[PDB]
Amino acid sequence: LSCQLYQR
Amino acid sequence: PPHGELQYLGQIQHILRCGVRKDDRTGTGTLSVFGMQARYSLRDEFPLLTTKRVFWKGVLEELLWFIKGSTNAKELSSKGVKDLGPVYGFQWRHFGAEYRDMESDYSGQGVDQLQRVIDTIKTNPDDRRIIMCAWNPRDLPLMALPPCHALCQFYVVNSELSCQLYQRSGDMGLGVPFNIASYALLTYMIAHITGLKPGDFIHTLGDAHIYLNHIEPLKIQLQREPRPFPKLRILRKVEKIDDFKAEDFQIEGYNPHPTIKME
Amino acid sequence: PPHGELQYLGQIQHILRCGVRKDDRTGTGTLSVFGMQARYSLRDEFPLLTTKRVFWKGVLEELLWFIKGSTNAKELSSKGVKDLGPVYGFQWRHFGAEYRDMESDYSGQGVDQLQRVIDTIKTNPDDRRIIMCAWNPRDLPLMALPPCHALCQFYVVNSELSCQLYQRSGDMGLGVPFNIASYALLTYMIAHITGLKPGDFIHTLGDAHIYLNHIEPLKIQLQREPRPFPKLRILRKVEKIDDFKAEDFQIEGYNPHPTIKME
């Protein structure tokens, strides 16, 4: 339930 | 060759006939189908729907607002469609940057997704990674790595710029016609400053849905015959994406059926 | 009702006819079409393609490898399917966490995208955000915010689980048949574990392409008539995604045309 690199 | 609005009409018709009942997050009912796609040519026409009058001024004005990265509702207040912190602007221009104030200087802070798309088109038009994402602002404090609401992928071959929008959900009655116009406009803008011609806009949905109270209006809209799409003219040679102003654009030969109020 | 492999064959056929020449990253030529979609029913059948034999054992094996989050190549070379740091598994199970070694304990480090999909299906099946992304590992050290190679969105209505895979590019000859099987298998696993039935697998592509040297082989594949898709049986009650082993799965009634070698 996600997405796009570590800083948000 | 068939009018491209027929795809949008066929998707409404398919959802009315084959959609299943599913609640949205507020417990409001929809008819829903998962997984849809439509392709709209941008070649010498512009896909502003004709089976109802679409508020083109608000499409233009709100895109321009997103392009300047604004988190200020007043710059969008007394225009047509009526202190923030996120929105599609801040994420398109300043992704992951420390937010402080709405009147704060963010120049070269975060990732500029939009400029990066433009630079990539210029430096490597074959690139398969020409991608920009937008988030629903309510998701941002909700979890780490929140999923985007929409992903937009650009593509170049033979001096034509195409765009595919993937939206995880699409409100067929209100949101979809407005998004088609919005991303078609964006494509026209990016094509113009990269010296390409607009190609296709491909619209791809996850949960494609109709709210129950739009059913009767949409059923009437389904019986209207599309008129030839209008054309979009850019009136000025424009050099950078930030330079566009509302007045640089003219919709020509827009001849729609009457306004339908959904809700 | 028409066999679902016909969609895949029609897509090959459309690229051969209407596809334009476009180089990939290495300057290798393809025939390319931007924006495609196919829907494969998962109801009482399994879309393992029949116009050529697909190496099912490697599908299963590689998927299970991803599900445990492995960054070790030889856990995928002692299995006969033919030190890392990234590949789809570490991003599926441990997104954004500090990498150190490959024999390290990453328990509760980063975001677990796969467990989060499973939990959301259980706590809120109407959710429009049930999304998991995978990255090409080459992209990770290349820029901040690298775009994903693939996004996968799940969807639940009437006790059925559907899956949509969006891939920014798709190798039609080699990669596509393999991914169809792979994400269809993942849906079967997540369905089994959440007490749902498999619904549809929707496959959506950005740059859908055929490598020039695959043209002759694919042209021959295009004259083969599909055989009824096989069925996939799960051979015990499995409780957690990490508990599945290769031996829990049996393909039945798989009757494919001969192997086609491409590359």
In angstroms, the Cα distances linking C53 to B185, B197, C78, C114, C232 are 45, 42, 22, 29, 16
Chain A residues whose CB is inside 8 A of the B96 CB are 5, 7-8
Give the Cα separation of C165 and C167 in Å (integer). 6
Give the Cα separation of C42 and C70 in Å (integer). 28
Cα separation of the two ends of chain C? 34
Give the Cα separation of C36 and C171 in Å (integer). 12
What are the tokens at C135? 């990255």
Hey, which bits of C55-189 come out as E strands? 131-134, 150-157, 160-171
Picking from B19, B23, B36, the residue whose alpha carbon sits closest to that of residue B204 is B36
Contact assessment for residue B50 and residue B233, using Cβ atoms and an 8 Å cutoff: no
Contact assessment for residue C12 and residue C218, using Cβ atoms and an 8 Å cutoff: yes
Distance of CA C83 to the CA centre of its chain: 24
What are the tokens at C37? 């979609």
Which residues does residue C39 pair with via DSSP β-bridges, in sequence order?
A: C202
Q: Which helix (H) or strand (E) holds C248?
A: none
Which residues does residue C200 pair with via DSSP β-bridges, in sequence order?
A: C41
Residue B217, CA atoms < 13 Å, CB-side half-sphere: 16
Residue C140, CA atoms < 13 Å, CB-side half-sphere: 17
Distance of CA B22 to the CA centre of its chain: 24
Give the Cα separation of B69 and B71 in Å (integer). 7
Torsion angle defined by CA atoms of residues C224, C229, C234 and C240, in that order, rounded to the nearest 10 degrees: 80
> Subunits touching B (CB < 8 Å, at least 3 pairs)?
A, C
Backbone angles phi, psi at B238, to 5 degrees: -115, 140
DSSP secondary structure, B32-71, as one string? EEEEEEEEEE-SSS----TTTT--HHHHHHHHHHHHTT--
Give the Cα separation of B229 and B253 in Å (integer). 8
Q: Does C164 touch chain B (CB under 8 A)?
A: yes
Which residue range forms the structural domain that includes residue B144?
1-263
Active site residue C133: no
DSSP state of B94: H
Pairing of strands C231-234, B231-234: unpaired
Give the Cα separation of B155 and B125 in Å (integer). 7
Which CATH number covers residue B20?
A: 3.30.572.10
Backbone angles phi, psi at C99, to 5 degrees: -85, 140
- Domain count for chain C, please give it: 1
DSSP secondary structure, C105-128, as one string? --TT-SB-HHHHHHHHHHH-TT-S
| Amino acid of residue B226 | P
- C5 three-state secondary structure: helix
Residues placed in the known binding site of B: 25, 128-129, 148-149, 168-171, 179, 209-211
The sign of the torsion formed by the CA atoms of C129, C135, C139, C140 equals positive
Closest Cα in chain B, distance from residue C200 (Å): 9
Contact assessment for residue B203 and residue B38, using Cβ atoms and an 8 Å cutoff: yes
Breaks (C-N over 2.5 A) in chain B follow: 82
C71 contact partners, CB below 8 Å, separation of at least 6: C83, C84, C85, C86, C87, C89, C90, C102
Helix axis angle, C175-193 relative to C56-67, nearest 10°? 60
What are the tokens at C65? 């490898």
Backbone angles phi, psi at C18, to 5 degrees: -110, -5
Give the Cα separation of C141 and C105 in Å (integer). 22
Give the Cα separation of B35 and B8 in Å (integer). 14
Instruction: Give the Cβ contact number of residue C258 at 10 Å.
Output: 8
Picking from C196, C112, C95, the residue whose alpha carbon sits closest to that of residue C154 is C196
Give the Cα separation of C163 and C152 in Å (integer). 7
Q: What is the resolution of this structure in A?
A: 2.3
C174 contact partners, CB below 8 Å, separation of at least 6: C211, C214, C262, C263
Q: Which helix (H) or strand (E) holds C38?
A: strand C29-41
What are the tokens at C86? 């990234």
Q: Which helix (H) or strand (E) holds C89?
A: helix C87-94
Give the Cα separation of B235 and B243 in Å (integer). 13
Inter-chain touch A4–C144, beta carbons under 8 Å = no
